[PDB]
Design a protein around this ligand. Sequence first.
Ligand SMILES: O=P(O)(O)C(O)(Cc1cccnc1)P(=O)(O)O
Ligand SMILES: [Mg+2]
Ligand SMILES: [Mg+2]
Ligand SMILES: [Mg+2]
Length: 339
Amino acid sequence: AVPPSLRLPVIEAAFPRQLHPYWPKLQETTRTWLLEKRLMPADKVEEYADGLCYTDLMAGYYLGAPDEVLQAIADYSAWFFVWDDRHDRDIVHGRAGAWRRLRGLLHTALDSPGDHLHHEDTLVAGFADSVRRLYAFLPATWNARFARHFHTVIEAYDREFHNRTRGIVPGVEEYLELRRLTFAHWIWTDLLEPSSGCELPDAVRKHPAYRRAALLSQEFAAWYNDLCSLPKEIAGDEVHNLGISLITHHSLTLEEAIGEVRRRVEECITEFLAVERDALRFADELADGTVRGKELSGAVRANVGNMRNWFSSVYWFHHESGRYMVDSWDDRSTPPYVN
Ligand SMILES: O=P(O)(O)C(O)(Cc1cccnc1)P(=O)(O)O
Ligand SMILES: [Mg+2]
Ligand SMILES: [Mg+2]
Ligand SMILES: [Mg+2]
């Protein structure tokens, strides 16, 4: 039972969940990875890790991925989450020096992950080992594009640190541009390609049907999270949320922004359904008769399928994960799973 303020019938009706066959071992390896990289303490991994559903989220998205591709994707996704918790914990304690060093370590490790596998900062070491495994699957042009995209993601996070510190809530349009980057839309879009085993040429992945579907996929995920994390994020003094920009810059009620947020999420789905047909026609055009044509068609059709998979994974993730159950915490401002 999804609460009705969050219930999306088109999702439940026409985007049935899928699950990767590797998920059971995926869940365990990542929990152990979290334990051995010391990205969380012992008792909170044992208590909270499984119930945070970070492996479920990715096992429901990257269908068809090689087990070791999925495993690296899921460690980095579990890493992405704790980096968000460390980023929010630096803000809450004005650790602007620590954030800045880490932010420069992260910028550096992203280009030379091997050189950081054993860095003193555990969070930098974990990231270096997931990114290093991420870099082994495809040519260094993919690896470079991944770095270019993550370099901008870090910078977006630095813009957030200075937004929450100086009290600035972004404007709605400033937020929609920033939210593509803090959510890391293009990271997740990049990782569609090791999951289907193929770097796409610029001409394929930048076709307007591919690009618009890839975009609407992430806009839904980012904006459904805003709808669903809004209570947690208000209680944690967070200001980066479409709901929050609409309240402070368009003088909307709490209940009015939530409907405008819900309404914008809903149109993401119906717009995706349209361009999905364009993107799938494009996949079939790519099968011109040649070998590389057949492969490029299959890779586009798998990635587009996983663009569709993202909706249901994200949707059910936000009702199953303990990360958003602010109502079950003794302290509504400090999630019990962060340090
Ligand atoms: O779980 P959260 O904190 O609501 C979030 O989605 C965490 C997150 C960060 C980056 C990518 N995906 C999720 P955020 O971006 O802070 O809104
Ligand atoms: Mg967050
Ligand atoms: Mg965040
Ligand atoms: Mg959020």
